[PDB]
Amino acid sequence: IQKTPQIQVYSRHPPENGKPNILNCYVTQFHPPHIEIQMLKNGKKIPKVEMSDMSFSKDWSFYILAHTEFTPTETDTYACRVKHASMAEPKTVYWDRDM
Amino acid sequence: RGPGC
Amino acid sequence: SHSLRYFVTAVSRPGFGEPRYMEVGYVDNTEFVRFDSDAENPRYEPRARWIEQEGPEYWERETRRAKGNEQCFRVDLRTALRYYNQSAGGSHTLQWMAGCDVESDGRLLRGYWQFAYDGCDYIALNEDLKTWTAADMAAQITRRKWEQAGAAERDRAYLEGECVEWLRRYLKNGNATLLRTDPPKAHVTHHRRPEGDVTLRCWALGFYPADITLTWQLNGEELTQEMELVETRPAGDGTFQKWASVVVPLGKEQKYTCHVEHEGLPEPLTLRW
């Protein structure tokens, strides 16, 4: 439709293997408000994903904060996948522990 | 407090 | 410059029932109340500990107001479908922003009260709090109707009186959380890239409020073009984080310095790798 989302995938506290952190998916500047967010560990959807900060900015564009509990390891892999009507195909942003 | 309609 | 603002959204959903209606209230751009018509038991809810000190007549009164606004927005979504002569089977969006910004003394500085349809400006109250700015012919109908009804006076009564007054009370009762200052904790990480050079990344973590400036210098000169910079993002615990990076030759890393400015810092931090 109109405004295409922007995605950041990051952890709350600095990541170090074994310690239970909290993974964040931050989605901004899209419109219409209907949006579909999935958070993945090794291509497998995580069941308990909370939402937060569902609102919009002075832009009129919507944003939302999605998070879940996780524990990073050396071989694990996490990502956030966002389906929105303004994109032809869903978009997957992988968590980089250095970003 | 908030506004109305 | 403090502020009390309310962001309201109604989203129609044909064949799925009545529109979803939501309110969020912010003080100094920090969320503290929220209403969600799709919640299990829909009512105004606290979102910060400090507002929890208000008595039950506050939550009932605001819940009463919210549920009434939801009814006015059901009508309006229908009124908007006919103005723009659109099909009735599609989803649409009506957004409403209202609030007051205040200068140090306490009385009004700017009043807001504007609407948007399907993500585009629809009608907004000018700075005079006396006239309206319409975006197309549809909102011109709304404008003259609200002119005939006297909508500016009633709306202006809120912004100059109540909004200003309650923001004054929210700041007193919530000063410790609202006006707290969490300095950023900073550090620099090293990342050898394949091209043979390096990426120096300068992190700021755990800070409040949100405003911050990250800058990379070299021998005192800011490097604003070759710099990389993410949008400030919420940590999830009320604080924020941000990082800024640059690409530098291997061996000269100690030449570059990152500067972090935040209102929690009496002096900007400086760090090297």
XYZ file of C-alpha atoms in Angstrom:
377
model
C 0.000 0.000 0.000
C 1.899 3.123 1.153
C 4.764 3.239 3.696
C 7.249 0.344 3.813
C 8.413 -0.820 7.276
C 11.920 -0.504 8.698
C 13.318 -3.340 10.801
C 16.015 -3.610 13.472
C 16.795 -6.835 15.345
C 18.865 -6.357 18.493
C 19.217 -7.634 22.053
C 18.424 -5.686 25.209
C 21.517 -6.436 27.264
C 24.905 -7.047 25.589
C 24.978 -10.598 24.221
C 27.255 -13.272 25.632
C 26.614 -16.970 25.071
C 24.682 -18.814 27.786
C 23.334 -15.754 29.590
C 19.555 -15.371 29.069
C 19.021 -12.124 27.196
C 15.923 -10.675 25.455
C 15.689 -10.275 21.669
C 13.969 -7.199 20.211
C 12.397 -6.616 16.796
C 11.732 -2.920 16.150
C 9.453 -2.067 13.214
C 8.818 1.546 12.225
C 7.425 3.958 9.636
C 4.832 1.745 7.950
C 1.205 2.214 6.937
C -1.494 0.739 7.023
C -1.321 -0.470 10.650
C -2.060 -4.139 9.884
C 1.245 -6.004 9.982
C 2.479 -9.539 10.633
C 5.659 -10.122 12.646
C 7.339 -13.474 13.285
C 10.507 -14.041 15.297
C 12.595 -17.088 14.457
C 15.204 -19.316 16.088
C 16.723 -21.544 13.388
C 13.848 -21.084 10.942
C 11.323 -22.051 13.633
C 8.657 -19.651 14.868
C 8.871 -18.778 18.578
C 5.503 -19.164 20.344
C 5.525 -16.520 23.122
C 6.187 -13.197 21.373
C 5.008 -10.101 23.251
C 4.029 -6.780 21.687
C 4.741 -3.304 23.006
C 4.658 0.388 22.057
C 1.969 -0.105 19.391
C 1.379 3.506 18.351
C 2.334 6.061 15.692
C 4.610 9.103 15.516
C 4.185 12.684 14.320
C 4.897 11.147 10.884
C 1.419 9.514 11.119
C 3.302 6.252 10.437
C 2.953 3.357 12.859
C 5.634 1.582 14.863
C 5.645 -1.346 17.267
C 8.048 -3.194 19.568
C 8.113 -6.998 19.469
C 10.251 -9.002 21.898
C 10.741 -12.516 23.251
C 13.029 -14.233 25.731
C 16.067 -16.003 24.320
C 19.499 -17.361 25.187
C 22.230 -17.001 22.551
C 24.800 -19.669 21.775
C 27.627 -19.869 19.242
C 25.701 -21.884 16.631
C 22.160 -20.565 17.195
C 20.561 -18.086 14.796
C 17.717 -15.609 15.199
C 15.758 -13.372 12.845
C 12.582 -11.316 12.518
C 10.216 -11.775 9.556
C 7.710 -9.052 8.681
C 4.809 -9.379 6.235
C 3.330 -6.046 5.181
C 1.079 -5.102 2.277
C 3.640 -2.565 1.004
C 6.162 -5.329 0.198
C 5.663 -8.008 -2.445
C 7.321 -10.700 -0.308
C 7.987 -10.933 3.446
C 11.269 -9.487 4.705
C 13.640 -11.353 7.037
C 16.239 -9.419 9.054
C 18.777 -11.629 10.819
C 20.071 -10.742 14.267
C 23.735 -9.741 14.114
C 25.217 -9.800 17.621
C 27.452 -6.858 16.599
C 24.542 -4.609 15.568
C -6.678 13.751 31.331
C -7.505 13.053 27.718
C -9.828 14.687 25.205
C -13.268 13.595 24.043
C -14.556 12.893 20.500
C 9.615 21.941 27.149
C 7.113 19.484 28.595
C 4.107 18.044 26.803
C 1.005 15.896 27.304
C -0.157 14.189 24.103
C -2.718 11.556 23.141
C -2.456 9.398 20.007
C -5.714 7.791 18.863
C -6.267 5.246 16.077
C -9.363 3.523 14.680
C -8.979 0.816 12.024
C -12.008 -0.627 10.263
C -12.129 -4.329 9.386
C -15.035 -5.358 7.137
C -16.512 -8.742 7.953
C -14.434 -8.898 11.157
C -16.701 -6.730 13.345
C -16.463 -3.148 14.620
C -13.305 -1.031 14.191
C -10.409 -1.545 16.565
C -10.036 1.588 18.683
C -6.894 2.540 20.617
C -5.596 5.411 22.738
C -2.084 6.045 24.048
C -1.167 8.994 26.288
C 2.388 10.329 26.568
C 4.108 12.782 28.913
C 7.437 14.153 27.654
C 7.152 11.547 24.886
C 7.018 8.709 27.472
C 3.997 6.396 27.381
C 1.904 6.216 30.551
C -1.726 5.290 29.683
C -3.202 3.033 27.021
C -6.615 1.835 25.817
C -7.190 -1.078 23.431
C -10.741 -1.973 22.402
C -9.550 -5.490 21.484
C -8.111 -6.224 24.931
C -9.473 -8.918 27.192
C -11.576 -6.542 29.314
C -11.081 -3.146 27.591
C -10.383 -0.237 29.948
C -7.805 2.491 30.491
C -4.664 0.922 31.986
C -1.533 2.241 33.709
C 1.728 1.851 31.793
C 4.076 3.467 34.338
C 4.234 3.005 38.092
C 3.837 6.707 38.889
C 0.380 7.098 37.355
C -0.748 4.079 39.431
C -1.116 6.449 42.391
C -4.345 7.868 40.898
C -7.629 6.751 42.420
C -10.289 4.566 40.816
C -12.437 7.510 39.741
C -9.603 8.486 37.373
C -9.569 5.121 35.562
C -13.371 4.944 35.422
C -13.650 8.489 34.063
C -11.021 7.909 31.372
C -12.512 4.517 30.471
C -15.851 6.290 30.122
C -14.240 8.901 27.860
C -12.397 6.335 25.756
C -15.466 4.168 25.116
C -17.357 7.311 24.075
C -14.593 8.366 21.703
C -14.674 4.890 20.162
C -18.351 5.486 19.383
C -17.671 8.881 17.787
C -14.956 7.223 15.655
C -17.302 4.458 14.454
C -19.522 7.194 13.007
C -16.592 9.066 11.563
C -15.142 6.094 9.724
C -18.539 5.759 8.051
C -18.745 9.498 7.343
C -15.316 9.281 5.700
C -16.292 6.379 3.417
C -18.998 8.465 1.764
C -17.070 11.766 1.469
C -14.396 10.030 -0.601
C -17.079 7.797 -2.215
C -15.194 4.582 -1.466
C -16.260 0.948 -1.383
C -17.646 -0.209 1.958
C -15.758 -3.526 1.953
C -12.235 -2.213 2.551
C -10.204 -1.343 5.642
C -9.490 2.289 6.491
C -7.662 4.262 9.166
C -8.533 7.388 11.150
C -5.807 8.838 13.387
C -6.122 11.634 15.935
C -3.351 13.495 17.756
C -4.186 15.994 20.484
C -2.229 17.596 23.278
C -0.390 20.574 24.700
C 3.234 21.696 24.874
C 4.185 23.989 27.753
C 7.057 26.363 28.486
C 8.937 26.541 31.768
C 6.488 28.784 33.644
C 3.531 26.492 33.052
C 1.082 28.093 30.657
C 0.498 26.985 27.082
C 3.078 27.199 24.286
C 1.445 25.205 21.476
C -1.883 23.388 21.239
C -2.393 20.439 18.899
C -5.531 18.768 17.559
C -5.226 17.210 14.108
C -6.623 14.250 12.178
C -5.379 12.015 9.383
C -7.283 9.665 7.081
C -5.566 6.607 5.542
C -2.192 8.026 6.574
C -2.690 11.441 4.940
C -3.417 14.753 6.651
C -7.138 15.488 6.891
C -7.782 18.465 9.205
C -5.625 20.280 11.761
C -6.138 23.132 14.225
C -3.868 26.087 13.449
C -1.561 27.731 15.971
C -4.179 30.428 16.643
C -6.501 27.764 18.122
C -9.202 29.684 16.241
C -9.164 28.373 12.641
C -8.736 25.059 10.807
C -6.534 23.892 7.918
C -8.200 21.411 5.561
C -6.327 19.165 3.155
C -9.008 18.549 0.497
C -12.690 19.152 -0.218
C -13.819 16.367 2.117
C -12.193 18.074 5.103
C -13.705 21.381 3.938
C -17.132 19.943 4.804
C -15.786 18.997 8.232
C -14.225 22.450 8.578
C -17.387 24.494 7.983
C -19.462 22.114 10.114
C -16.980 22.480 12.986
C -16.953 26.226 12.301
C -20.747 26.349 12.558
C -20.713 24.200 15.724
C -17.963 26.207 17.448
C -15.533 23.310 17.700
C -12.465 25.525 18.162
C -13.682 27.134 21.404
C -14.534 23.814 23.066
C -11.287 22.269 21.804
C -9.304 25.349 22.863
C -10.876 25.188 26.327
C -9.301 21.754 26.766
C -5.821 22.650 25.511
C -5.395 25.911 27.422
C -7.147 24.770 30.611
C -7.378 21.073 31.452
C -4.510 19.637 29.336
C -2.133 22.264 30.709
C -3.470 21.734 34.229
C -3.210 17.933 34.315
C 0.239 17.915 32.707
C 1.294 20.117 35.620
C 0.025 17.408 37.991
C 1.546 14.512 36.031
C 4.975 16.141 36.224
C 4.754 16.681 39.982
C 3.554 13.143 40.729
C 5.823 11.462 38.173
C 8.944 13.637 38.294
C 11.208 10.842 39.525
C 10.607 8.556 36.552
C 9.667 11.205 33.970
C 12.512 13.656 34.601
C 15.161 11.137 35.639
C 18.428 11.132 33.723
C 20.290 7.931 32.890
C 23.744 8.616 31.427
C 24.754 6.433 28.481
C 27.318 3.709 29.084
C 29.652 3.763 26.085
C 32.263 1.449 24.577
C 33.927 0.759 21.234
C 34.160 -2.567 19.396
C 36.609 -3.730 16.735
C 35.660 -5.565 13.540
C 38.172 -6.600 10.877
C 36.373 -6.557 7.532
C 37.302 -8.668 4.477
C 38.355 -5.662 2.349
C 41.368 -5.408 4.668
C 40.313 -2.301 6.610
C 38.409 -2.146 9.931
C 35.014 -1.091 11.262
C 35.123 0.790 14.564
C 31.675 0.729 16.174
C 30.877 3.152 19.003
C 28.007 2.019 21.242
C 25.771 3.985 23.596
C 23.605 1.899 25.914
C 21.063 2.211 28.706
C 20.370 5.954 28.464
C 17.312 8.121 29.130
C 15.856 10.286 27.765
C 16.076 9.499 24.051
C 17.885 12.489 22.516
C 21.585 11.867 21.875
C 24.304 12.708 19.368
C 27.040 10.303 18.272
C 29.936 11.767 16.304
C 33.238 10.364 15.031
C 36.195 12.757 14.914
C 39.637 12.446 13.333
C 42.270 14.881 14.627
C 39.341 17.036 15.749
C 37.388 16.950 12.466
C 33.906 15.432 12.427
C 33.424 12.656 9.853
C 29.729 13.067 9.109
C 29.713 11.513 5.620
C 31.615 8.220 5.955
C 29.768 7.502 9.232
C 27.100 4.831 9.712
C 24.284 5.414 12.158
C 21.194 3.455 13.239
C 17.986 5.049 14.459
C 17.683 5.308 18.235
C 15.830 2.239 19.445
C 14.063 1.221 22.673
C 15.832 -1.273 24.926
C 12.483 -2.494 26.285
C 13.145 -1.384 29.884
C 12.526 2.349 29.430
C 16.064 3.187 28.270
C 17.460 3.518 24.753
C 20.471 2.495 22.671
C 22.302 3.649 19.543
C 25.554 2.956 17.727
C 27.692 4.815 15.178
C 30.486 3.266 13.104
C 33.270 4.239 10.695
C 35.745 2.419 8.434
C 39.436 3.107 9.128
C 42.814 1.760 7.979
C 44.443 -0.991 10.014
C 47.027 0.490 12.397
C 45.661 4.033 12.759
C 42.669 3.097 14.944
C 44.049 5.137 17.855
C 43.660 8.292 15.711
C 39.833 8.243 15.783
C 37.685 9.299 18.743
C 33.955 8.917 19.367
C 32.024 11.717 21.083
C 28.776 11.035 22.955
C 26.541 13.960 23.964
C 23.571 13.397 26.283
C 21.802 15.609 28.796
C 22.857 13.144 31.500
C 26.494 14.064 30.839
C 27.966 17.309 32.222
C 30.653 16.808 29.559
C 30.652 14.711 26.375
C 32.329 11.339 26.761
C 35.373 10.619 24.618
C 36.677 7.139 23.862
C 39.189 5.394 21.613
C 39.552 1.757 20.657
